[PDB]
């Protein structure tokens, strides 16, 4: 197995996190405690070919998703609401994920993950017109 998305990642930048949560209707006090918890974002990925295991965690919370590119799966929005998700590739090293809520009305959300040439992992998370960008390095 050669060098791909696979590995353990630790966050180093986190731009527009608060603003994203606001759009997602999170009250001030929780946004701030959330911004605090985000400087300990760890991501572990196992990638085999087309197929992905991803663990995102902070000090007190973790979640795991499993998916194949091109095949619908379920997870939660950043705000916690369950959703149907679909991942597609965009270049050698970027995937994007459109999301439709299971139940109800809310902002259009989506995320991306990309591996840069300097070997950083870059996560984006979009709610409507607001885009949160997070940068990660190998652990």
Swiss-Prot record:
GO terms for biological process: embryonic forelimb morphogenesis; epidermis development; fatty acid transport; positive regulation of collateral sprouting; regulation of DNA-templated transcription; retinoic acid metabolic process; signal transduction. Induction: By retinoic acid. Sumoylated in response to retinoic acid binding, sumoylation is critical for dissociation from ER and subsequent nuclear translocation. Keywords: Cytoplasm, Endoplasmic reticulum, Isopeptide bond, Nucleus, Retinol-binding, Transport, Ubl conjugation, Vitamin A. InterPro entries: Calycin, Fatty_acid-bd, ILBP, Lipocln_cytosolic_FA-bd_dom. All-trans-retinoate binds at residues 134-136. CDD domains: CRABP2 (cd19461). It holds the Pfam family Lipocalin. Changing residue 22 to A: Loss of ligand-induced nuclear import. One of its GO terms (cellular component) is extracellular exosome. There is a cross-link at residue 103 (Glycyl lysine isopeptide (Lys-Gly) (interchain with G-Cter in SUMO)). The keyword Transcription regulation does not apply. Its main location: cytoplasm. Forms a beta-barrel structure that accommodates hydrophobic ligands in its interior. PANTHER family: FATTY ACID BINDING PROTEIN. Belongs to the calycin superfamily. Fatty-acid binding protein (FABP) family. Transports retinoic acid to the nucleus. Regulates the access of retinoic acid to the nuclear retinoic acid receptors. This is Cellular retinoic acid-binding protein 2. The gene is CRABP2.
């Amino acid at each position: 197995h050669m060098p791909n998305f696979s590995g353990n990642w630790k966050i180093i930048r986190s731009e527009n996190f608060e603003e994203l949560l606001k759009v997602l209707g999170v009250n001030v006090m929780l946004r701030k405690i959330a911004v605090a918890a985000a400087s300990k974002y760890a991501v572990e990925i196992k990638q085999e070919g087309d197929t992905f295991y991803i663990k995102v965690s902070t000090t007190v919370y973790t979640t795991e998703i499993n998916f194949k590119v091109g095949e619908e799966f379920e997870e939660q929005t950043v705000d916690g609401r369950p959703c149907k998700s679909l991942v597609k590739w965009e270049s050698e090293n970027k995937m994007v994920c459109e999301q439709k809520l299971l139940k109800g009305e809310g902002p259009k959300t989506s995320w991306t993950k990309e591996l840069t040439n300097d070997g950083e992992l870059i996560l984006t998370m979009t709610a409507d017109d607001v885009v949160c960008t997070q940068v990660f390095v190998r652990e």
